[PDB]
């Protein structure tokens, strides 16, 4: 009867009734911690229920932290656009440049020629490709450069419920594969570098974690969880015609024609971006960041430097004969990317969302909420450490679904640092579970910017994404526990304290 | 001689690449001339200045230069320069842009403009005055470019309706056309200085104050408004008199009033969304004003000192735009089971906001703040103060006149925001070296960098007006020369008479030393 009427106004009802429901939190724990927890819970609920746009919810700290006395405006506001956000913006601009010159179509047609007209094989090929791209570029960047290519593929082979299901599956597998792939390498995603920095700050003695050890530990995790995710996606979606379809694919590739100068320039700039990102500071061989002051340079500097070239590099081959040829027309050349097209195609909502995550992370750190959570985790000492770490990675994997991976790893890593020494257990045996599990962001489009990029297409629903992310999180947690039980104990020698 | 012309044309064709690849080569000697950190910071600042003035790179891309240059050159680490791009001043700017987008999306701006045009009159001088008043009062909150772009069609329609012999009549017609087409961008530029969110340079002043003098907080929305609004009104009246004398000659009226009515009636009745947006904008302005007027204790005194700012108020106000319904809610909807259950539309959707907010200006403000921070940390400001030794005996008032004239005539070629970004550290150092309040030199520069009246390339509103075709460059120059002179004189009067009381510039402050 009235259920439809109530559901019609669900957004306003959530907006007005969430602070009322979260009010007892403020009185439950100490004042500043209570206010910070209230803000975190309000932001998480508004993100899950989509009561407000993800950017508008991301701007909540600017209003709530100063009013509640947690952080001043001049402290919460600068956190919104940190160097990690600049790296993400540079990756988004690079993806926009790649898509703007129809290089994504070329890559898509090459992938179809390599694989063939089979939805499951194409899905697996994109899982592999996006995971490979995620080990060297950040998850958001790989997702932004791979959704255009996936959409090109889908428009290629398909030119009714089966088609729509393939749409859903092959548009949702890309952000999920990127999130899975970010974990294997330290350079793969920001939370790994955050973990390394927090380990260096907290534990100068502990230095067993490097690029090689982390890679050999986490690449099997990539393979296992990627196979599990691919099987889950295939089961959920999709369970002389072939010659004609392949002939159409060759015809489309020929219709693409020879590769233009702008396409090659953009591809070379992308390759330089990836190479300079990887070689900036490897943990086994010093990078070119050692040629400068220590700690001055980061991935943001490289991203902005590479992106700046796109805005002045010519999109046509420059000929020295033009200067001598007085008969040639004197027309201005088109750069690789104009700022108008970039501003049109850059998702500033994702930038604001990441900034809100950073701001809420700093608010949690400054208000003393993290210390309070660490203190409340005290009675988890008579409980055996194995399933204790299991439940810790469970709660981390189910908390990263609201905020960004960076925000949740920053929030939870010092808590685990205090907890591990308090409980007489190996610090890494808690460091690495949380760092890996923060990337297990699969429920909501707000969980990670890859999910937002995928959801921006409009072919994905919240219900289907949550249904997939349930089992994705469960298998990720189980594989994390298995890794910590079998081969993490010997690679990182964390089985003996 | 034709070969030289062809070579010059070819050089001008590739001027952007030539400037971009030759500016570092030309600016290399400053690194060797100066101490290392100061020299590198000066090289970066001059490179950004040249790139902004010549438009070799997009303004946003040039604003991202510090993120590359400061970490490489050791001036400032990445984790210290990157957060400078969203200081709370930039979030106040973003909130103002969101409010302006909400106002424009519901045609409230057109309704206000047409109402003011109806009220002011139809007489030539009265029509010019009403057009200028509308453009200036509407540029306080909208961008000057948007106000000019909306007001040009209305002025064109009114002029066509009004004039629907020999040299006298058509000369008068063309002069009247020129007067209306020149009165809009000048009024927009004048009005932009009235409010902090009116134009970017005011927020640049705020952000660079946050860096050079973190202890300085006397400049806020209320103080800036109470300082600039009388000055804006005086300069607007002076410009109106000047334009009317130059051009306005200081049934047709019935037809013009009829076309204004028809343009107003086409807006339809005032809808609930327009009223809601107007009320939200009024609360926005009032709460920005009354947060800390500095002469009545504002509502910020009810919370922790130093925690609240104009950014918090702006974000809180513009948050309501994204969930407040656009249609009037009805209590009977719950009772009426037969009514459709269609989802309601908010006042502003994030799609429209994202597609109607100029993120380029946000990045430009962030780049300016980052450059100010780098100049402060690198010690280049101390070097500039040391080198400003000869300019120590100059009277402070004469110094204000000279800096205002220089900045007002410099902005005629480059962007106002870039001009103020480049000039603000120099003004700060000169004010420090003169044993006078830093604001006494910062505020004249911030106000005068918007005194861009002489060229179509000075401001985008000037280009919009020039695109009509009824105006020549000579008219621009003749009007803007005396416009600049009058603006400089009025700015000096304001800075010497009543800005002293508003900003307490009489005594050198403790935080300035
Ligand atoms: C589209 C066309 C181009 C548009 C360009 C837009 C920007 C233009 C800005 C104005 C022109 C550039 C600034 C002036 C030239 C560069 C500054 C300079 O000359 O610095 C080096 C110089 C060295 O002096 P030195 O030999 O040390 O003196 C003896 C004691 N050592 O130092 C001195 O002589 C000392 C005095 C310095 C005074 C301040 C100079 C910098 C002002 C701007 C700072 C930002
Ligand atoms: C914060 C308190 C709440 C908000 C302020 C108080 C309520 C204001 C009225 C409600 C909103 C009105 C609609 C929104 C547009 C603004 C008004 C406007 O220009 O509408 C035109 C109308 C006059 O023309 P109308 O009679 O509608 O013509 C057709 C019928 N013959 O106009 C009118 O009839 C109304 C004229 C209103 C004049 C307001 C003057 C300024 C009030 C203080 C503003 C403070 C902030 C300034 C920045
Ligand atoms: C539905 C969404 C918005 C909120 C869901 C969580 C709510 C219902 C939870 C979170 C924390 C909870 C509080 C935590 C602790 C206490 C103290 C004790 O007296 C029991 C009730 C009380 C006061 C709880 C009430 C319910 C509570 C406020
Ligand atoms: C609602 C979902 C997302 C889980 C979020 C956990 C929050 C809402 C709940 C779970 C556990 C709860 C806490 C459990 C124990 C205590 C200690 C007691 O002395 C006061 C209440 C307090 C401090 C509770 C506050 C609310 C709390 C932190
Ligand atoms: C059929 C077998 C024997 C030979 C296949 C050769 C061609 C089709 C293969 C060999 C190497 C392949 C490339 C290897 C890596 C990448 C990078 C990835 O981000 C997009 C696809 C792309 C660009 C592949 C496209 C297809 C490719 C060029
Ligand atoms: C162009 C691509 C390959 C990246 C840039 C080149 C990289 C690989 C080069 C350029 C400068 C090089 C560094 C220069 C000097 C040293 C000091 C030496 O004691 C250890 C290696 C180390 C730290 C080098 C590592 C490799 C390095 C970083
Ligand atoms: C300064 C020295 C190195 C020589 C000049 C180098 C640079 C500035 C020159 C070399 C080749 C030139 C290009 C050659 C041809 C064209 C195509 C024409 O339709 C627009 C200009 C454009 C795109 C020129 C721009 C300037 C250019 C890139
Ligand atoms: C919700 C996010 C932000 C934080 C992570 C969850 C936190 C709040 C949860 C996870 C584990 C929880 C604790 C689990 C067990 C106990 C013992 C009980 O006798 C009192 C509550 C207490 C001490 C809980 C307090 C809240 C707690 C620390
Ligand atoms: C880029 C254009 C528009 C502005 C002018 C840039 C060049 C020509 C200017 C900027 C600053 C100047 C330098 C400033 C100071 C000195 C020290 C002394 O030895 C005199 C020459 C020398 C070394 C100047 C040489 C020319 C110079 C490098
Ligand atoms: C909310 C607005 C738009 C309409 C309501 C009237 C305005 C003028 C009201 C609402 C709240 C009011 C403020 C509430 C509290 C204080 C603190 C007191 O020590 C001085 C007056 C001052 C600073 C009030 C000034 C007037 C004020 C700003
Ligand atoms: C304050 C608490 C107690 C009650 C809140 C009631 C709110 C959520 C109700 C009251 C009136 C309602 C509106 C009444 C009529 C319509 C038109 C119809 O197309 C549905 C949306 C819309 C626009 C409703 C949205 C929800 C609404 C605003
Ligand atoms: C539009 C024009 C004609 C009117 C304004 C003219 C300007 C230049 C005049 C008007 C008021 C004047 C100021 C009034 C009083 C003083 C105090 C005196 O101890 C030094 C000069 C100083 C600071 C004057 C400087 C010049 C001044 C600013
Ligand atoms: C005085 C009470 C302090 C604790 C509760 C604060 C509640 C703030 C709610 C803000 C909601 C913003 C989105 C509608
Ligand atoms: C203990 C001193 C502060 C008391 C109030 C804290 C909560 C303030 C909430 C303000 C919310 C404003 C929403 C627009
Ligand atoms: C046939 C291809 C020849 C080489 C083309 C190179 C284009 C530009 C690549 C990116 C260069 C970035 C540094 C200037
Ligand atoms: C070793 C010399 C240091 C000083 C000169 C550095 C020059 C950097 C030029 C950067 C240009 C960026 C825009 C093309
Ligand atoms: C004294 C230690 C640093 C030496 C080099 C300083 C200048 C570096 C310039 C790098 C420019 C990079 C442009 C992309
Ligand atoms: C007779 C007056 C009718 C007014 C209709 C529009 C009301 C808009 C109210 C907006 C309130 C925003 C803050 C809650
Ligand atoms: Na996350
Ligand atoms: Na304006």
From Swiss-Prot, chain A:
Location in or out of the cell: Cell membrane
GO MF annotation terms: alpha-ketoglutarate transmembrane transporter activity; citrate transmembrane transporter activity; dicarboxylic acid transmembrane transporter activity; glutathione transmembrane transporter activity; high-affinity sodium:dicarboxylate symporter activity; sodium:dicarboxylate symporter activity; succinate transmembrane transporter activity
The residue spans the entry assigns to the Cytoplasmic side of the membrane are as follows: 1-11, 72-77, 315-343, 365-382, 448-467
Characterize the regulation of its activity: Li(+) decreases succinate transport in the presence of Na(+).
Q: Which disease appears in this protein's record?
A: Leukoencephalopathy, acute reversible, with increased urinary alpha-ketoglutarate: An autosomal recessive disorder characterized by acute, reversible neurological deterioration during febrile illness. Patients exhibit reversible leukoencephalopathy and increased urinary excretion of alpha-ketoglutarate.
Catalytic activity, reaction form: succinate(out) + 3 Na(+)(out) = succinate(in) + 3 Na(+)(in); 2-oxoglutarate(out) + 3 Na(+)(out) = 2-oxoglutarate(in) + 3 Na(+)(in); N-acetyl-L-aspartate(out) + 3 Na(+)(out) = N-acetyl-L-aspartate(in) + 3 Na(+)(in); glutarate(out) + 3 Na(+)(out) = glutarate(in) + 3 Na(+)(in)
Across the pH scale, how does activity change? Optimum pH is 7.5.
A Pfam family matched by this chain, by name?
A: Na_sulph_symp
Which organism does this sequence originate in? Homo sapiens (Human)
This protein is called Na(+)/dicarboxylate cotransporter 3
Which InterPro entries has this protein been placed in? SLC13A/DASS (IPR001898)
* Family according to the record: Belongs to the SLC13A/DASS transporter (TC 2.A.47) family. NADC subfamily.
TM segment ranges: 12-32, 51-71, 78-98, 133-153, 166-186, 215-235, 258-278, 294-314, 383-403, 427-447, 468-488
